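Help wanted!
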Amino acid sequence: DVNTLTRFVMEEGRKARGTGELTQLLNSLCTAVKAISSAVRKAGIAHLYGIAGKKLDVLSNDLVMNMLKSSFATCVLVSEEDKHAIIVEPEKRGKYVVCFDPLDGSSNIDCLVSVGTIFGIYRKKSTDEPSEKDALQPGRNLVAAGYALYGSATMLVLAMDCGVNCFMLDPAIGEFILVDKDVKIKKKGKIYSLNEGYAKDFDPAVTEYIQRKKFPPDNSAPYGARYVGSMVADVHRTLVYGGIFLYPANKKSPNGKLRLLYECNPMAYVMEKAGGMATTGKEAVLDVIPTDIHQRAPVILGSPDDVLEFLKVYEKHS
Amino acid sequence: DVNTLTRFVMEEGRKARGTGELTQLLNSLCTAVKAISSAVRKAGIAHLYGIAGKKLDVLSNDLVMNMLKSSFATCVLVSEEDKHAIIVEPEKRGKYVVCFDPLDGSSNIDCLVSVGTIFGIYRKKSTDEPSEKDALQPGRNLVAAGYALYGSATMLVLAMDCGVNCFMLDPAIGEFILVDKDVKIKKKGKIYSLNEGYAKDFDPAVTEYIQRKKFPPDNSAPYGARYVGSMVADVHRTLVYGGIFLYPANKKSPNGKLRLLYECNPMAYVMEKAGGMATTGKEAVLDVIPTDIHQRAPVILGSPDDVLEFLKVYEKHS
Amino acid sequence: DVNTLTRFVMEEGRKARGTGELTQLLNSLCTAVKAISSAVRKAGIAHLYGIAGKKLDVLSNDLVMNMLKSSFATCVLVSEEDKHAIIVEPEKRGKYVVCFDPLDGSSNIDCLVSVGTIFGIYRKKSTDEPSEKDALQPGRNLVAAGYALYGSATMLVLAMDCGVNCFMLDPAIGEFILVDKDVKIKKKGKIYSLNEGYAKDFDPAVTEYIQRKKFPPDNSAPYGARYVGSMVADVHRTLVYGGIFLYPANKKSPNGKLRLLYECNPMAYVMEKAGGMATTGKEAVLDVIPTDIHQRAPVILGSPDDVLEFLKVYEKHS
Amino acid sequence: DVNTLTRFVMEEGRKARGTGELTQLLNSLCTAVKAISSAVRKAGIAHLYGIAGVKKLDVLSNDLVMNMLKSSFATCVLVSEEDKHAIIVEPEKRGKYVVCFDPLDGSSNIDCLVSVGTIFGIYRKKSTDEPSEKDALQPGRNLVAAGYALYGSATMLVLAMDCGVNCFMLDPAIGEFILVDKDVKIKKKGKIYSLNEGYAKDFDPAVTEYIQRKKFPPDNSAPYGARYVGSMVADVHRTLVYGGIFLYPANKKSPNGKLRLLYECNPMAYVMEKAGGMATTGKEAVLDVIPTDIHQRAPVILGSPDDVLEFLKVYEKHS
Ligand SMILES: Nc1nc2c(s1)CCc1ccc(OP(=O)(O)O)cc1-2
Ligand SMILES: Nc1nc2c(s1)CCc1ccc(OP(=O)(O)O)cc1-2
Ligand SMILES: Nc1nc2c(s1)CCc1ccc(OP(=O)(O)O)cc1-2
Ligand SMILES: Nc1nc2c(s1)CCc1ccc(OP(=O)(O)O)cc1-2
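Answered by r_m:
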């Protein structure tokens, strides 16, 4: 029996026996994602080059912003693109808080590298006037999270309490088709991913760990290396093929470079729901209690045995 | 003035003052590429999952094979997908030889990583009955070469004697729009690309070179690292942002890992026509005379200053 | 504030405060319509003609049939394509009955004339085992009805108790965009539509009426004539521009030619919810009590003043 | 062996053994047609309705054709319904062809989603002087190529040349026109007549009698079915595929007809004749009319030969 994102979402919403607000939020998000995908694949670029005789990042943010606001299901919106949290106008306020990166990896979208949209959805816990404080919740409180990868094909990975599900966007009918149910990451992978250009500033634990991947002390086969530079792409590969992804801290970046609210938490949530792990080295990403909507957080995620091994090395240096 | 791949090709062909055969070959290749793109983005996948109640690489190969044969411009076709060179039936024989990889990086297509089509076009040099020997020409004899990158967007890079030109596929009208005329690679980049998981087996010169990128002896800023795993993606990034890409021999693959005819030569041609370099370490990729259609070849390409620097290190270890 | 078919449907469903079944049904139908649209515009026809080396009406029927069944919201399905009503297997039964024409006007599809999908939704009113009898309800009992016109662009007209709304399918993102809220037909039009090739067999009332349109009683300008041959196209034009559409009974077809359950009723419902009228001449189409799922019914619909005028002539001949 | 518009055009151009200019012209036209199709199917309409928080379709269509032809470097004079005057291509972009076209026929009624299309006729500049409106004033008999794009349930491009008529289906998945009907020929006789009967009151006697014969056959044969979409491209295409007759004659009010000779009548007349059909004004073949004004009107009766001949018999009976 064929399944679409819309049908899947409506059914889960029906089961929750609530107001149906989250369903509207997800539907709106889904539509925004297809709009972003269309723009990312350069639909209509011919008109830009004069066939008939301005930024993807900003457009992507506008799409998500507008779709979520008009869903009447949100009250506070945090975007990697805005300095301050956006407070939805009173007449369109819903009970959910959404943190997202409209177009992750857009910094290098010129080489046509894969890009994506990352998002995390929380329920406003407080009754107070909606404010940026409502987005300051530990990833452990997530109701739903996931991402859209605009790669060779467009896929939406959605994670909730019930697990992780992957949907493929069929451009012929603009429909997200369920192609992978209750996804689980491999217990152990054969691929490690991180920018080794930072080697000189690597934390000792990171240096030793990568060294064990290249020169396994047990003379087993070394891990292969992959680093796209776009978190969505690297994390998705990690989920599908298993392995480990790192963007750790160092003397010069005590807290890392990726952002906790809309990059680390959503990915940590997906990973844990898929049987994987996500750590800052000192603790689970999802347990970090944020104080700033844009605060950074180090992150090591992927296959459990691989993350556990990293933590072993980390511990050795603590 | 807007320009399309079709218009551009027809114009160049008109100037060459020939039979117009290459024009038909390129037109057919262009069509095959759009077909591949449509399938790679998963058009119609809903039907595969039962909305109404072959493998991508095989389909891709069929598309190119069929379009080239029916162009009446080719006589010998070598594909990464077929063990033997395909000899075009007599009634459809043209004077060109085409070596191509229908879907480069398809091995890791499950993670939605970028994939592409690489191609190299030669003029049949020998007058003997067409055979696999017609494809055994040094890259230096290429009439045209290039690739299609199916990434965030689909782009076709075409290289000829007159230079390199980039076209963006506008999905709205199925037209390749010229967006970058006479492209030239940066003299020097800030990114190095290669699978460092092979560190253990790297040749000494490669080890030292990478070491210089991470720990500049001149204490300048270290190069950033990126490795997608898909040659088309990695090479395209190198072209756009400059830098260097490597896939040198391993102690486990003494003759390199990438294939000379449909991976190395085409990319080397694009690089040289863009002002860059491509070497096996011992010589220019384009000068290697092939003896086997699927023989491997090491390859170091990218910005001239960067490749020259690698060659300096290489020499120091020779 | 932008609105989509999905968002609109979910909102109306949320207000009805029911099980959410009709929502799932409509969502499923919407997806089927996009699939039909894609096939009607000939997506992938290149493969049919050998680029790489079933009938549209059958496919359309399969799409609707499969999407409805898998919605878990239907129990009885009547299609212009099937002699007998389809009874949904027990494990997929819902409380709705759907009568539809998968691809209206497909008989003359070879000329690329507009085609469409017509549908009428009823709630099973009985407590017995689902059967063909559940589809034999007067149009007056419709819960929702409408159609998809596959013309210059694809539009879905949906009618319910709250009125008529028009959605435009945006091929770029496969989303139905609301472009016309609470639509109302003109009180009086200037166009009449019917196959005048039947003149010889016309009922006297029809002859006189058409005569009044060509040679106006109040020396008013004559009505313009338009007859596409596809009910969906002709009816949609009547809705948008006002006027009147006819397919009356004659000497050989005393019960008309169009089918009551999936052609006449749906259109009559749309018309009345838009402030228009639909009559068989003797009574309102929606009041006819069917005895056979495929029975025919004459039909005169469109602007109220126009239909009333027809009825005046009709009565003069009774 | 699969064939596309591009491959087909390039091959015919290669055969002609010329400069390759017409090939570039056709390529450019093909591209413009796909862009028009995309817009007609409402791609991106969501942005117009605020999904992220605008010119008329006929204007845009005209701009696309205009821009693509000019940049083809193959044209010198362009006539479109949109501009009162013929456009003279700037010297540095001049080619030897003259193109008359209707960017978006039937756009007067595009709100009801009725079929619309693009009609075009290509001539070779036959003068030695400075390009001017006068170069577009050639009888349809001089056409080098003509055809149309129908934006209906699907998008098809009908191309006619000396070698015959060929139909291409636009595959939206790959933006390619696929040849699906080679050397098309219209039925010798059809069973459908098409014209706006709302003008009955002003019909010329010959037209009145002819329509009368289709509804009430003399030999008591089966009457013809009636079809009138209101969009010339749709009505004409139906006529080509199913055979029959299409009419938009002159009457009392409209003495020289309503349709335009250069970009509506001539192109369709050329397609019809190359397909074995006919196109007459009643007094003579549409293609033989020598124009004096780029926007002059001309009556037109076209379709299956036997049907047109029959019309002409009635017409003569009233002359
Ligand atoms: N479409 C989905 N809705 C929900 C999903 S999926 C998971 C759990 C959930 C919990 C509460 C809830 O409350 P509202 O219905 O938003 O009031 C909604 C949902
Ligand atoms: N469309 C293009 N054709 C050519 C290009 S681009 C570059 C150089 C070239 C050289 C010879 C040639 O001879 P044929 O026409 O193949 O006989 C054709 C071409
Ligand atoms: N999506 C829509 N649902 C309804 C609409 S639109 C109009 C009236 C309606 C009435 C009852 C109902 O009950 P279930 O939800 O089917 O149980 C559902 C609906
Ligand atoms: N692609 C096509 N070209 C032609 C076709 S089809 C029909 C006859 C023709 C005649 C002359 C000609 O001269 P240029 O090549 O325009 O100089 C070109 C053509």
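OP: Thanks! One thing I noticed: The domain at 184-318 of chain D is CATH 3.40.190.80 (D-Maltodextrin-Binding Protein; domain 2).
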